[PDB]
Amino acid sequence: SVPSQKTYQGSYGFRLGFLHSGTAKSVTCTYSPALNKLFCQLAKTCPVQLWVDSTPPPGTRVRAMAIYKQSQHMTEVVRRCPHHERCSDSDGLAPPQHLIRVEGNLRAEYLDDRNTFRHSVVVPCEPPEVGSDCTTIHYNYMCYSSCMGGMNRRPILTIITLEDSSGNLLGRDSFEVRVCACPGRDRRTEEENLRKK
Numbered sequence: 001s002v003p004s005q006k007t008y009q010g011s012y013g014f015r016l017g018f019l020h021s022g023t024a025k026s027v028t029c030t031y032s033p034a035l036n037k038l039f040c041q042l043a044k045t046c047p048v049q050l051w052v053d054s055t056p057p058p059g060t061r062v063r064a065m066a067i068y069k070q071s072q073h074m075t076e077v078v079r080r081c082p083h084h085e086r087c088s089d090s091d092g093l094a095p096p097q098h099l100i101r102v103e104g105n106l107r108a109e110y111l112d113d114r115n116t117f118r119h120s121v122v123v124p125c126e127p128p129e130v131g132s133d134c135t136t137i138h139y140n141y142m143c144y145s146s147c148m149g150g151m152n153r154r155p156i157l158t159i160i161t162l163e164d165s166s167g168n169l170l171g172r173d174s175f176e177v178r179v180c181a182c183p184g185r186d187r188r189t190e191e192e193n194l195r196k197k
């Protein structure tokens with residue numbers, strides 16, 4: 001089956017936010033609102049903001065999962081390629097097969113779904129630090145979009161779900177991801193292609 005990607009703010013007004021990092025050749029992570037697409041380098045920090053209009057209950061969690069965007073591939077599990085799953089870059093918590101990691105959160109849990117075999121990473125939802133307006137999760141993507149035997153140039157989406165302590169849905173948002181060597185140039189190219197279209 002295919003997990004839902006429907007945007008759903010839910011009772012708490014849940015949605016994502018992204019920094020404005022620009023498109024310089026040196027940028028390591030940059031988000032395109034026009035494409036709803038994050039462009040990032042391999043294994044580099046991707047800050048994703050969480051916003052709500054009202055306070056959710058203790059025990060609320062935030063899960064991230066990748067799926068293929070194209071209909072002809074959506075049923076295939078997104079995983080790291082045959083090289084990267086074996087390169088011993090473990091952080092001590094993430095299974096080596098998982099594309100998406102959370103950086104710097106010892107409460108992150110990694111799920112291999114016993115029925116769908118899909119991978120996800122989930123953390124407790126936390127209020128913003130004192131003086132901040134939102135909460136940020138730092139994600140890493142551990143293969144290139146181009147990796148042969150893995151994503152193999154197929155576009156993916158990341159689905160972020162706000163969940164209760166049982167795993168029931170409270171909110172959902174999503175964004176496309178390209179993991180690439182030059183996110184700034186690729187964002188500029190894809191935005192210009194969109195404008196020409």
Ligand SMILES: CCn1c2ccc(C[NH2+]C)cc2c2ccc(-c3ccco3)cc21
Pocket residue numbers: 050051052053054055056057058059060125126127128132133134135
């Ligand atoms: C989703 C992260 N986030 C926010 C993000 C933005 C804002 C608005 N600021 C102007 C408030 C919150 C917030 C309030 C409570 C909790 C919370 C309580 C228990 C667990 O999580 C989590 C929260």
Ligand SMILES: [Zn+2]
Pocket residue numbers: 080081082083084085142143144147148150
């Ligand atoms: Zn790879």
